[PDB]
Write a protein that binds this ligand. Structure first.
Ligand SMILES: Nc1ncnc2c1ncn2[C@@H]1O[C@H](C[C@@H](N)CC[C@H](N)C(=O)O)[C@@H](O)[C@H]1O
Ligand SMILES: O=[N+]([O-])c1cc(O)c(O)c([N+](=O)[O-])c1
Ligand SMILES: [Mg+2]
Length: 214
């Protein structure tokens, strides 16, 4: 008598340690491996996300698509006080799960969750969320929004030289229009990490695209 996202949260509440981000991630990944698949970036691709954050040291991050909060918890746990991870989530029930997950994980002081569609919120970031430019963007929402939101981020002046875009699922389910754009454009320098779809033995990959300036 509940939703899958509630079942994931409840599993965390009963199995993970309050305030322990590692333990929250482990409980989510265990539940989704063993009981019900869900579209979290997961532990194998999450290790690649962690390495990108360690390599580029962002302190202002934007996430597109929060779902149950797995990736927000994963990324926020690596950030130091004063860092900001702004996450945009269009589905208000998912947003409600994400806020509870972030709170339980102990990272709420680093996370600003915004309910709404990325295309509506992105142009408000500078004036309403006190953003200058972004250090890193994690794209993980509906894949047909990757390219339009990348273009919007650029038009809105949110990318500086050196901003890191990191996109999940560029192979499966796929983001070919986004890939063709960033790989063909002199405005980006791209790296591809081959990996696997979360919780499955199916090939996937992430693309890192560094903005070079207009
Ligand atoms: N235009 C959009 N703006 C914001 N969120 C969106 C949009 N389109 C889809 N979403 C949400 O994107 C999320 C997609 C998930 N794959 C996110 C997973 C999350 N990044 C994680 O790894 O834990 C869902 O919760 C969607 O409701
Ligand atoms: O269908 N899937 O396998 C996925 C996987 C994912 O990792 C997703 O992020 C996704 N989505 O946001 O639509 C869908
Ligand atoms: Mg994904």
């Amino acid at each position: 008598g509940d939703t899958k996202e509630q079942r994931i949260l409840n599993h965390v509440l009963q199995h993970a340690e309050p305030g322990n981000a590692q333990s929250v991630l482990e409980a989510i990944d265990t539940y989704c491996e063993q009981k019900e698949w869900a579209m979290n970036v997961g532990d194998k691709k999450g290790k690649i996300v962690d390495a990108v954050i360690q390599e580029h040291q962002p302190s202002v991050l934007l996430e597109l698509g929060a779902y149950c909060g797995y990736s927000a918890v994963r990324m926020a746990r690596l950030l130091s006080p004063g860092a900001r991870l702004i996450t945009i989530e269009i589905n208000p029930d998912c947003a409600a799960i994400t806020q509870r997950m972030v709170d339980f994980a102990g990272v709420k002081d680093k996370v600003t969750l915004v309910v709404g569609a990325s295309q509506d919120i992105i142009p408000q970031l500078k004036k309403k969320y006190d953003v200058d430019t972004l250090d890193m963007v994690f794209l993980d929402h509906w894949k047909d929004r990757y390219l339009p939101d990348t273009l919007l981020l650029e038009e809105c002046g949110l990318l500086r030289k050196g901003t890191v875009l990191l996109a999940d699922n560029v192979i499966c389910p796929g983001a070919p229009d986004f890939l063709a754009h960033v790989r063909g454009s002199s405005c980006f320098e791209c790296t591809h990490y081959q990996s696997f779809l979360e919780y499955r033995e199916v090939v996937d990959g992430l693309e890192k695209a560094i903005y070079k300036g207009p």
